[PDB]
Here is the input.
Amino acid sequence: EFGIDLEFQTMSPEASEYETCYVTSHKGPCRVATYSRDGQLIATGSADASIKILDTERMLANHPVIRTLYDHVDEVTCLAFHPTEQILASGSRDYTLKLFDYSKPSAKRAFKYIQEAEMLRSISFHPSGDFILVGTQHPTLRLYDINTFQCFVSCNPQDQHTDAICSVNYNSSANMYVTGSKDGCIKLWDGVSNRCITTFEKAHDGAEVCSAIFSKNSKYILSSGKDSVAKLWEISTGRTLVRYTGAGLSGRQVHRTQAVFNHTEDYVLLPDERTISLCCWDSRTAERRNLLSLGHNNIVRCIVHSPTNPGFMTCSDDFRARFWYRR
Amino acid sequence: YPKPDTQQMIPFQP
Here is the structure.
């Protein structure tokens, strides 16, 4: 329960103090990873349509790749661990949402799947594990019941985004969720009602919003956009409190990448495409800290930080996923 | 955790 609270000194290592502790390789670009809620496991997905499950303890220290799953026929684009069960939800450009039961080492295929109308872009498990939020290329957000496979949407169509959903995340308590879209909006949603509470328009000066997460206390949203700026928003007021600047480039549009907190939310981390390095700022002041050279031979499209530890995963178009940890 | 109130919502078919 250590987190950012601007209403009321950091207590964790900068990004620059982390080192690569394990490298894994897919047969195509690796553009998604996710942490299990307990932080012990990481799943990686690739354009080679396969999924790896990785044990963080083995990576720190028997093969770290404890699972490989092959039940997609196109790039996997999103992943979410079931909060209580040994199940991984997977979303692909092959229009499917797959559920994998990974309790058995031998398991290769998914047990159930949802066939979708659009390519999946972002999923977020409800902390109960009974529901999954689904962002697709289509502007309207889907709530699926994991047990009945019925799908539900807000009763007010004006709530919806007006372009592809890029990210969906529940907050820590499930009373809210947050979406970011190609329409350049962040939307705050009621987790029970499933109505849109707030729309942050031109959240990143008109550019696509690539990622939006909550701070642990749910008082803030951290977002990033294709204006290559990370922002800390205060939900209560609807305003940007902190601007994390310095990343990006001139001349071409940047590819999609995440801005994350470290486990204590002392730092905001954003991969920079210009240098293949990780920008790191103090979260409270926006002070630029040391740049972390990532060692990737191409752009990092996905970064996920451990919820519990000073660990994170970087996913690259070089086909590789690098596990980072402050030893 | 609270749960989504699906009755306050409308079914959707892609």
The radius of gyration of chain B is 9 Å. Chain B touches chain A at residues 1-6, 8-14 (CB under 8 Å). The CA atoms of residues 2 and 8 of chain B lie 14 Å apart.
